[PDB]
Amino acid sequence: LYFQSMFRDQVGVLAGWFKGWNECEQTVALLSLLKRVSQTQARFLQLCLEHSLADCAELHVLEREANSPGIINQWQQESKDKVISLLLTHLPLLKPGNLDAKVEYMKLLPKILAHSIEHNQHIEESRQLLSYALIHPATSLEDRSALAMWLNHL
Amino acid sequence: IPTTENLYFQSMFRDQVGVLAGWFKGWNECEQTVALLSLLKRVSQTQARFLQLCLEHSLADCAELHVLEREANSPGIINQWQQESKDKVISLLLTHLPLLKPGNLDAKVEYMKLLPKILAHSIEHNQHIEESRQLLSYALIHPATSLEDRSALAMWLNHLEDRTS
Numbered sequence: 001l002y003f004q005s006m007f008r009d010q011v012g013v014l015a016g017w018f019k020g021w022n023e024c025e026q027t028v029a030l031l032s033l034l035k036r037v038s039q040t041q042a043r044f045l046q047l048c049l050e051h052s053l054a055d056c057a058e059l060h061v062l063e064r065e066a067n068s069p070g071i072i073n074q075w076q077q078e079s080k081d082k083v084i085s086l087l088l089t090h091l092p093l094l095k096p097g098n099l100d101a102k103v104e105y106m107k108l109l110p111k112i113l114a115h116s117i118e119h120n121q122h123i124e125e126s127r128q129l130l131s132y133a134l135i136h137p138a139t140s141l142e143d144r145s146a147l148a149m150w151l152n153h154l
Numbered sequence: 155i156p157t158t159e160n161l162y163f164q165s166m167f168r169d170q171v172g173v174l175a176g177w178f179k180g181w182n183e184c185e186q187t188v189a190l191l192s193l194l195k196r197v198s199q200t201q202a203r204f205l206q207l208c209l210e211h212s213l214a215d216c217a218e219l220h221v222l223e224r225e226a227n228s229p230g231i232i233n234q235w236q237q238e239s240k241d242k243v244i245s246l247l248l249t250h251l252p253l254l255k256p257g258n259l260d261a262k263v264e265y266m267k268l269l270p271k272i273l274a275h276s277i278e279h280n281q282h283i284e285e286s287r288q289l290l291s292y293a294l295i296h297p298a299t300s301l302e303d304r305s306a307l308a309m310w311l312n313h314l315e316d317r318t319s
Binding site: 001002003004007010011014015017018019021022023024025026027028029030031032033034036037038039040041042043044045046047048049050051052053056058059062063089092093095096097123124127128130131134136137151 | 158175
């Protein structure tokens with residue numbers, strides 16, 4: 001592709017910043033740009049992502065787990081470290097219209113945050129979980145109010 | 155909002171996102187799409203799926219978009235566009251090619267027939283050069299195009315750049 005030299009330089013700066021960001025930062029920055037594109041650009045990028053992920057078998061296994069309210073509910077029987085691991089790897093795969101699964105994620109979070117905010121442990125994981133919950137289209141305004149108060153307490 | 159415990163890092167992240175927003179607002183739609191693709195290729199499968207779900211949610215009930223998508227994936231409709239004025243064909247291709255579904259082979263064949271016709275006219279008459287470059291760029295990054303398609307599209311792009319330089 002033939003591009004303006006300034007644009008090439010800016011994309012180079014972008015790549016450097018992106019490599020230095022954590023995954024939460026990367027996701028948030030990308031969302032900050034995807035909110036500004038046209039519906040047609042958004043659909044094109046959606047098609048690109050769908051094409052790239054179409055035959056990702058391991059991803060599909062995680063997605064099914066992430067959308068199974070019974071599976072999610074059972075995670076309360078795991079150690080704190082494992083539940084935080086499960087939430088971080090599965091919450092981004094929750095489908096926006098899966099209300100029953102969403103409810104099970106919202107039931108597990110306040111238990112994990114209390115322990116973390118008390119034993120000053122996994123606070124970053126807790127912060128990454130609250131960030132992902134706050135930007136997840138599945139969460140309601142009432143969910144997001146609760147999520148915000150849990151951030152204030154943290 | 156909170157992405158780091160480090161207060162210095164949190165403030166610098168916000169600064170960077172601001173600069174990014176300013177750059178993005180000044181980019182044309184082709185630059186924006188290419189810049190976004192240059193980041194999406196770097197994310198994990200899980201990040202990619204999350205962003206995909208967000209896009210799908212935002213677009214789910216976009217009625218006017220859906221009308222354009224149906225046109226963009228109808229080979230008979232696309233084929234008829236060759237009867238339109240060169241200005242209209244350029245406009246139709248710009249607005250519909252990004253909506254072509256990656257496995258719609260028959261629709262893709264019709265785009266690959268129309269693109270050389272509008273590029274030959276643009277090169278001969280020194281018109282629509284920017285739009286032609288954008289159409290070729292979109293086609294070259296389009297998940298629907300094959301490696302053979304992209305060899306042909308690169309041929310056309312080099313010819314356009316050679317004839318306009």
